Symmetry: C4
Subunit: 164 residues, 4 copies
């Protein structure tokens, strides 16, 4: 499929089902899926970097990005298209060489500009229709992994090669 | 769609799937869905205030309401119809100009009196039948967003206009 | 529906989906569903007490029981049939006048001896086949409410009566 | 079913749906399903030890292993096949007498070598195809219980015998 040099991803509604847990004390949680770490694995296996673009800003996400050895983390991003363009500048690539997955309004402008756009099955219809590949999985169900595997054309042969 | 001047909403079973998480220490959680924040976005985009009426009283909900810039928050409400009527008086509107979404016994009197009544798909059947519009989504699945988008007639053109 | 004078219930797998959340510090959580409180409402409306029999013993459940004004709470119960017999003996009640809902091995002896036995849709097949009424809901989905409404014959007329 | 002398299991994605909950303070949760404890019950009832092999290392799992009286607990395992072979050598059994359930890349080598391999319905397709028995349940839904019951041929007669 289309050649990709950078994989970018939103968090809420992609790495999660959109859930934001609040308690009585000011603490907050997100629920990640260990399945998604394999998306980082396949990307790094093919020598492709992964960056997170999120509108939120939390220690939750910083620690998760650390655990998964994500290459870039941008939090509190107000303009994701600008952020992506700037990062493309740094790497000497075009948006045409980027695969991005997001699920909501703040992702729309960037989704429309990238080489491959992914949107989970759980997303609003007017975002889902921006997706250029079909994703079966919902947010939090391992849809980041699904996206990476499809974008990179990971097949049974690739699997067999890594489990020797 | 009927003219609407105020959107009101329950929390438990609408903004959540009814889940109430308890630990061993007296703390408590709810799980919100980031998708519902777009309900506030659309309402405010159309100049319409949003109010929360809940029979619970928690810091959980105080914090979530603040995060989403909800216009009105009423907690520990014992009589939601009276509460809605009083707010209408203060605003110079009548219940026929209100859209309300709720899911259970304490919402029924108000559901029967508003201009547009919404009830999530997850709700008890005797409450569900009070709904005057069909909602596909369950509590916690983004059903508040679904309600707002339906009530305000948010369409593709409206979406295209905001992502420019 | 036959005459019922006491409604008894398990917690894990009935009031919850079986979920037991553990953290890194020795704390523990359960997720309840606010829908189930209506089960207590209907029982009390009909003048029927509710008791909890659970094999676990937690502050989680003590607090939840208090919040819902449950009439009886017995925790750390090893022999649920004996516990039920002893409670009923204090109240003058025959097991045939009891409705009990449970979901697992420790509930089977009691389920086989009560007037109405309920088992959630999510339960192991060997237990589900002991249910004497059909319950559509899974643990944590409001199946306690479902059980009470069916056992007490709660219909649209009862609903109309409480909201008028 | 074939002769089994040891049951081994992964945690994340088998005993859970893969969920990893992070808060703002460095704490972490997993959500277990009480249903899975019956897996240990049946195994011990047939005189068969159970061991956990997991690549994570948490107090969460120490606590859950203790609660369920699991015979062996190995965490931070990087090579599950080697760990299993070493354990087998110690017990004087071979891999053909082991039943193992896992869901992801780190489980594949061992799944290919055991006497009975189980993989939950929620797992990646290239792992699921390694399963030698059909499992209907997803991670966190009681799939460890399902695996044990199938591996040990637990039938209605067994159930009847234990509830007398
Ligand atoms: C070899 C491997 O893939 N390690 C991955 C593990 C396993 O999925 C986990 O140990 C299963 O139990 O998950 C992480 O720790 C995680 O999602 O938190 C990230 C890590 O990159
Ligand atoms: C521009 C915008 O829509 N901001 C909304 C964000 C994004 O949905 C989030 O940043 C996605 O990562 O969610 C909130 O913070 C929230 O649900 O907590 C409310 C806020 O109004
Ligand atoms: C009138 C009524 O139903 N009160 C019930 C409420 C409402 O369901 C809740 O206020 C909705 O927001 O829930 C509880 O507080 C609860 O489940 O914790 C129990 C209580 O008996
Ligand atoms: C007799 C029995 O099987 N006890 C099991 C209980 C019951 O399932 C529970 O008490 C239901 O309320 O679950 C555990 O405590 C657990 O999953 O934490 C393990 C324990 O082995
Ligand atoms: Mg998002
Ligand atoms: Mg409600
Ligand atoms: Mg139970
Ligand atoms: Mg796993």
């Amino acid at each position: 499929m289309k050649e990709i040099k950078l994989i970018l991803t939103d968090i809420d509604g992609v790495w999660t089902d959109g859930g934001m847990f609040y308690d009585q004390t000011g603490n907050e949680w997100k629920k990640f899926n260990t399945s998604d770490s394999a998306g980082i694995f396949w990307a790094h296996n093919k020598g492709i970097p992964v960056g997170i673009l999120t509108g939120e800003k939390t220690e939750i996400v910083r620690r998760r990005a650390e655990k998964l050895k994500v290459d870039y983390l941008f939090q509190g991003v107000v303009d994701k298209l600008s952020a992506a363009e700037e990062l493309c500048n740094e790497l000497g690539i075009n948006l045409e060489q980027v695969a991005y997955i997001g699920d909501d309004l703040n992702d729309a402008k960037l989704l429309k500009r990238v080489g491959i756009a992914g949107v989970p099955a759980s997303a609003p219809f007017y975002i889902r229709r921006l997706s250029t590949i079909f994703l079966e999985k919902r947010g939090g169900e391992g849809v980041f992994r699904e996206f990476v595997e499809k974008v990179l054309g990971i097949n049974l042969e690739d699997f067999i090669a890594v489990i020797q």
